[PDB]
Design a protein around this ligand. Structure first.
Ligand SMILES: Nc1ncnc2c1ncn2[C@@H]1O[C@H](COP(=O)(O)OP(=O)(O)OP(=O)(O)O)[C@@H](O)[C@H]1O
Ligand SMILES: Nc1ncnc2c1ncn2[C@@H]1O[C@H](COP(=O)(O)OP(=O)(O)OP(=O)(O)O)[C@@H](O)[C@H]1O
Ligand SMILES: Nc1ncnc2c1ncn2[C@@H]1O[C@H](COP(=O)(O)OP(=O)(O)O)[C@@H](O)[C@H]1O
Ligand SMILES: [Mg+2]
Ligand SMILES: [Mg+2]
Ligand SMILES: [Mg+2]
Lengths: 384, 394, 146, 50, 50
């Protein structure tokens, strides 16, 4: 295990033959040394004789307690599971490194001495926020933007996949990225393409669930979010619909607008605090960019500000080519009449028509979609 | 030539490492055990020494002593209160009242005094580790640094120039300006160079869920701070901890004002804090309370304004001293294009213009690579700008 | 029985209270305002009657309360919400000072810097008698202060 | 429009639909022969199914 | 029948709740309001049956 990290010649040289044959002698001499322990001092079997001695030391009932402090001369104040806490001692088979205040431990039943530590069963909120698998298809599913698809790779993908271009420049990557525009243009759609592509851990939270019903439970939820994001990996924190923290007032929140405010002060800390930040990239998205606090959008917290426009009428035709790719489309239809139907139909409307017109065909058990399917589709989707 | 011959002689000896380390004992990936050849000290001896002679000594809390006799009144977590006595191994000296002690399970007598409870959410806000911002990175505001550095560290590094002159130096200082100006940046340089404990407090951490729970956290801060010989408290974003008392009708934000009042009492009056120096940093000072803006608490009122011209030209030299540039560019021309800009924006210009070199192919930025960055950062992100409604501090 | 000092925050209110702690050789007892606020119910109320019973025992004693607007905030009628547990500690401090079973053994010195916040139930005449104010120093006192 | 897949309206019932709601809920009642539930359903001018 | 006079003096059995098992033939079981116990299994009970 991690015996030698040198692999650098990478050929059929004698140097690769020399190094590993040196290591061959460092292993056998270490083998033959430790072999002569049991030859002259048998004294045990050591596969079980030390083990069963430990297993007979530790009692068969094993109570579970809680750490709250350590005094490093192998005795610490531990809390029992009722609430009455003791001043028991710690053993030597305890590996006194995995002990934090709040870690669940194993105790003796007789004198309650700290026998072993317990691996924690965590968590019912990490698995909530952590995206399990890659969501959907690739960047080729998008179509039409092609100017900011370069931009997001520039700040997320390319700092991760090519860590040589910023070094030859002598620069650090831009920190924050926000995404804004009208509703239904592809803000949430682009973030799935990033989570398809990346090898980082990807955390998502919606801005509406940042507000809590108790006092101070809001800023506690933010502090432990960035704790989770930092403790894993190079990671990507995606916060969607963050204007919703300030627009909608809910009667669950006992603190009024001045509990929204204290949460945003904590969020204002966690992006550009004084603490050592680490490798965490922040992506944000909204559709009401003018409402939120300008102190949160200052450079240093969010560097890149990407606008999404409405789909142009030659980018619209590309979107119909995507959502009607794998459907058995009858040759009656003409897509170019469908394009200029609404003058500002978003990319969401195109999928809203193409999914609905397929639903009309299954009412009549058909397999191909005709023209009058689309004729009654935009009446159903748009006009109400 | 010897393609497989260097491979299989490599591969078996990498296996022969594993094939005999399984015959020593590091294996059986545990549920909380030790490495096997590390606990051998307590294998026979301290097994029957740290367990069989040694006892459990359940820990308690003492109410009071009484005269003429030991006769201590003790208290435990949920059970009763007892009348106890000492052991032979401790003097009756350091068994002073209101102190946690360990107590056997049969006779109920006191074994050893204990260090008190530290309330661990205050334990996590001691910094333990220093950041890497030097005063050489806070260029452009030298006069503000000098007027700050003479309060925080010069009575600590030389506590004799003041005493022989007979003056008591100031204690409190707040740092205020528009955002992105250098307040949190200049606070990191102080924790770089200093040597006392540097306990940081973000003002959004004192909002608690119960009533008066936020005010007890202020004390446990100032209890462990008085134990130290010198400590340096840092308050950040204190517009959340208290603006002003305005109580009207339905008592709203009454809870946060009591936390703001307990902080006021720990700063002045009645056997003061001693050698504790505080340091606030806010974004809008006009909301703050007049009894907190009073000197004797917040003596120094250092301003962080925008850089003038030579503040700006110095900041370009800081954030572009470490990047591959064309030799023949002038920074003084660039700082005339950013009239009311912050130091955080100037760093974003320098990082953006290095990206344009990465956009096409090249390895060193040009002067026109800078100018394509200025009109994007200064003039195309000017819809947001964050400054002009904070210059008036509203 | 009961004195009250008020005014702008830098006029010197604690400075008289620290002066009297050095002059008389009585049992001086001091309080913070938000110290009488507890998470559990009835503990801040219990903490008031424990303090006055302690100053009852040391019969020459005076009690000091700093920042009285922490607990003495004016009561208000509202549904659906509002704090209540703070008023219980106030309403015993009204009673345990003055009312049923009164005493002349302890003297109260109270100090705040804002007055209009306070409940008129604690500014009656019998609970806090002599309400003195501290004006800002006019001209001549500033020559004496510095 | 891309958010909700299909919206379904529930109107108040008419004369043909007030009859069979009566027909299902008169199942568990011990009736008398000769009722003419049609005349009963027309007296309610579409209240609801409740 | 006359065995139970010298059978019922044996103390009763607790009832608990399995969370999950682990290495080397043990399970993690919690009691009513009492703390979680790492206990071993008997020989007549399969771990995958637990
Ligand atoms: N430019 C586009 N190209 C292809 N599909 C698109 C485009 N824009 C939107 N869509 C389709 O619309 C659907 C929803 O888009 P999305 O929700 O990402 O828009 P949005 O702006 O994030 O919406 P909101 O503003 O409500 O968050 C996506 O599933 C996508 O298939
Ligand atoms: N005078 C300066 N010299 C060099 N860098 C600066 C200067 N001012 C700001 N910066 C840059 O600004 C960033 C830190 O800003 P800081 O967090 O101090 O803003 P602030 O004044 O605390 O306002 P906020 O509280 O909104 O953050 C750092 O990235 C730093 O490089
Ligand atoms: N002669 C004086 N008159 C007024 N104030 C003084 C005088 N001498 C000193 N002081 C200052 O007044 C302060 C007293 O604080 P004080 O006004 O009582 O605070 P608060 O009223 O907010 O409790 C002391 O810090 C002291 O330095
Ligand atoms: Mg979306
Ligand atoms: Mg800051
Ligand atoms: Mg005072």
């Amino acid at each position: 295990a991690s015996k030698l990290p040198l692999v650098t010649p990478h050929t059929q040289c004698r140097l690769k033959l020399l190094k590993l044959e040196r290591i061959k002698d460092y292993l056998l001499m270490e083998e033959e040394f430790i072999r002569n322990q049991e030859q002259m001092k048998p004294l045990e079997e050591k596969q079980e004789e030390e083990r069963s001695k430990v297993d007979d030391l530790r009692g068969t009932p094993m109570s579970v307690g809680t750490l709250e402090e350590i005094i490093d001369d192998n005795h610490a104040i531990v809390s029992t599971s009722v609430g009455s806490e003791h001043y028991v001692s710690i053993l030597s088979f305890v590996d006194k490194d995995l002990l934090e205040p709040g870690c669940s431990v194993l105790l003796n039943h007789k004198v309650h001495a700290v026998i072993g530590v317990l691996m924690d069963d965590t968590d019912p909120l990490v698995t909530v926020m952590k995206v399990e698998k890659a969501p959907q298809e690739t960047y080729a599913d998008i179509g039409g933007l092609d100017n900011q698809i370069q931009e997001i790779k520039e700040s997320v993908e390319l700092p991760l996949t090519h860590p040589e271009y910023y070094e030859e420049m002598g620069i650090k990557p831009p920190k924050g990225v926000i995404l804004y525009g009208p509703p239904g243009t592809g803000k949430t759609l682009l973030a799935k393409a990033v989570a398809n592509q990346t090898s980082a851990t990807f955390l998502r939270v919606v801005g509406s669930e940042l507000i809590q019903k108790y006092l101070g439970d809001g800023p506690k939820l933010v502090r432990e979010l960035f704790r989770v994001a930092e403790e894993h990996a190079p990671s990507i924190v995606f916060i969607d619909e963050i204007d919703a923290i300030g627009t909608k007032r809910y009667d669950s929140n006992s603190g009024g607008e001045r509990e929204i405010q204290r949460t945003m002060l904590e969020l204002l800390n966690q992006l550009d605090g004084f603490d050592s930040r680490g490798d965490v990239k922040v992506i944000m998205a909204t559709n009401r960019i003018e409402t939120l606090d300008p102190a949160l959008i200052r450079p240093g917290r969010i560097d890149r500000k990407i606008e999404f426009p409405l789909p142009d009428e030659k980018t619209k035709k590309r979107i119909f080519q995507i959502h009607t790719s794998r459907m058995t489309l009858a040759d009656d239809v003409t897509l170019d009449d469908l394009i200029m139907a609404k003058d500002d139909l978003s990319g969401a409307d195109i999928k809203a028509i193409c999914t609905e017109a397929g639903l009309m065909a299954l009412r009549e058990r058909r397999m191909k979609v005709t023209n009058e399917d689309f004729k009654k589709s935009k009446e159903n989707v748009l006009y109400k | 030539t010897y393609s497989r011959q260097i491979k299989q002689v490599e591969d078996d000896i990498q296996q022969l490492l594993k094939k005999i380390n399984e015959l020593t004992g590091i294996k059986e990936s545990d549920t909380g055990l030790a490495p096997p050849a590390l606990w051998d000290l307590a294998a026979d001896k301290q097994t029957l020494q740290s367990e069989q002679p040694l006892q459990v000594a359940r820990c308690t809390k003492i109410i009071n002593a009484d005269s003429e006799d030991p006769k201590y009144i003790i208290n435990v977590k949920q059970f009763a209160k007892f009348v106890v006595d000492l052991s032979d191994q401790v003097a009756p000296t350091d068994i002073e009242e209101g102190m946690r002690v360990g107590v056997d399970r049969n006779k109920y007598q006191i074994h050893i005094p204990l260090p008190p409870k530290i309330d661990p959410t205050v334990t996590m806000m001691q910094v333990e580790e220093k950041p890497d911002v030097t005063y050489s990175d806070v260029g452009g505001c030298k006069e503000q640094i000098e007027k700050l550095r003479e309060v925080v560290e010069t009575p600590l590094l030389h506590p004799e120039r003041f005493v022989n002159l007979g003056i008591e130096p100031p204690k409190g200082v707040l740092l205020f300006g528009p955002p992105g100006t250098g307040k949190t940046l200049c606070a990191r340089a102080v924790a770089n160079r200093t040597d006392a404990c540097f306990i940081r407090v973000i003002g959004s951490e004192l909002v608690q869920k119960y009533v008066g729970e936020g005010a007890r956290m202020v004390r446990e801060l100032f209890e462990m701070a008085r134990t130290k010989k010198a400590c340096l408290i840092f308050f950040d974003e204190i517009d959340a901890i208290g603006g002003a008392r305005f109580d009207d009708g339905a008592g709203g934000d009454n809870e946060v004002q009591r936390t703001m009042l307990e902080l006021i009492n720990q700063l002045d009056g009645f056997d003061p804090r001693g050698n504790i120096k505080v340091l606030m940093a806010t974004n809008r000072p006009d909301t703050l309370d007049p009894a907190l803006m009073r000197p004797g608490r917040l003596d120094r009122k250092i301003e962080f304004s925008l850089p003038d011209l030579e503040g700006r030209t110095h900041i370009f030299k800081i954030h572009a001293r470490s990047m591959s540039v064309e030799r023949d560019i002038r920074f003084e021309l660039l700082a005339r294009l950013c009239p009311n800009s912050t130091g955080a924006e100037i760093r974003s210009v320098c990082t953006e213009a290095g990206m344009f070199a990465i956009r096409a192919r090249r390895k060193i930025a040009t002067e026109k690579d800078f100018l394509e960055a200025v009109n994007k950062v200064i003039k195309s992100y000017a819809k947001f700008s964050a400054t002009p409604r904070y210059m008036t501090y509203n | 029985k009961g004195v009250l000092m008020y005014g702008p925050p830098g006029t010197g209110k604690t400075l008289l209270a620290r002066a009297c702690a050095a002059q008389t050789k009585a049992t001086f007892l001091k309080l913070a305002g938000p110290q009488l606020v507890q998470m559990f119910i009835g503990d801040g109320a219990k903490l008031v009657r424990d303090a006055f019973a302690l100053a009852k025992e040391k019969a020459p004693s005076i009690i000091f309360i700093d920042e009285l607007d922490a607990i003495g905030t004016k009561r208000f009628d509202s549904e659906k919400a509002g704090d209540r547990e703070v008023q219980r500690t106030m309403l015993e401090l009204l009673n345990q000072l003055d009312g049923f079973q009164p005493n002349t053994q302890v003297k109260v010195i109270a100090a705040t810097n804002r007055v209009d916040i306070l409940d008129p139930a604690l500014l009656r005449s019998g609970r806090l008698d002599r309400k003195i104010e501290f004006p800002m120093p006019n001209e001549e006192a500033r020559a004496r202060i510095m | 429009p891309g958010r909700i897949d299909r919206k379904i309206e529930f109107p108040p019932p008419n004369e043909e639909a007030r009859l069979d709601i009566l027909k299902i809920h008169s199942r568990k009642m011990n009736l008398t022969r000769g009722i003419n539930l049609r005349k009963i359903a027309e007296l309610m001018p579409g209240a609801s199914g409740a | 029948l006359r065995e139970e006079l010298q059978l019922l003096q044996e103390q009763g059995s607790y009832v608990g709740e399995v969370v999950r098992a682990m290495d080397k033939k043990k399970v993690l079981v919690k009691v009513h309001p009492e703390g979680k116990f790492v206990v071993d299994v008997d020989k007549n009970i399969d771990i995958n049956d637990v």
